Amino acid sequence: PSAFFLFCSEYRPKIKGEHPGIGDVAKKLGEMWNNT
DNA sequence: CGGGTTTTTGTCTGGCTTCACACTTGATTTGCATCACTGTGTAAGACAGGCCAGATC
């Protein structure tokens, strides 16, 4: 486990509520994680 | 020579499981080339005994 893995496991429901479908969801997650 | 008998070949409707990108990134191990350092088989390389012929009193 790493910081990115923890952030993903913590904010996956965010992308879930945002878009159902997870290419674009994971892309946006990685983008916002690299931004923050 | 034509017909019969297996044998294999599929059908839609509706219903189960089941492996694969898709990014996501950043560690992990995986693999081939490189590094340190000698022992040795092998081929170049003089080398002196032997065999000579040219030579002098």
Describe the structure.
By secondary structure, the chain is an all-alpha fold. It has one domain (3-36). Helix content is 81%, strand content 0%. It has two helices and no strands. The protein has helices at 3-18, 23-35. Helix 1 (3-18) packs across helix 2. It comes from Homo sapiens (Human). The modification N6-acetyllysine is found at residues 27-28. The modification Cysteine sulfonic acid (-SO3H) is found at residue 8.
Note the topology.
Blueprint: H1 3-18, H2 23-35
The structure holds one DNA strand of 57 nucleotides.
PDB class: recombination/dna
Keywords: V(D)J recombination, DNA Transposition, RAG, scid, recombination, RECOMBINATION-DNA complex
Entry title: Cryo-EM structure of mouse RAG1/2 PRC complex (DNA0)
Over all CA atoms, what is the radius of gyration?
Answer: 9 Å
Taking the sheet with the most strands, its summary is: none
* Percent strand: under 5%
The secondary-structure element order is HH
Shape: globular
Q: Count the DSSP helices.
A: 2
Can you count the beta strands? 0
Report, as a whole number of angstroms, the end-to-end distance.
19 Å
The number of distinct structural domains comes to 1
Question: Structural class of the helices, strands and pairings?
Answer: mainly alpha
- The portion of residues assigned to helices is over 70%
Key features?
RAG; DNA Transposition; mainly alpha; about 35 residues; recombination/dna; DNA-binding; 1 chains; scid; V(D)J recombination
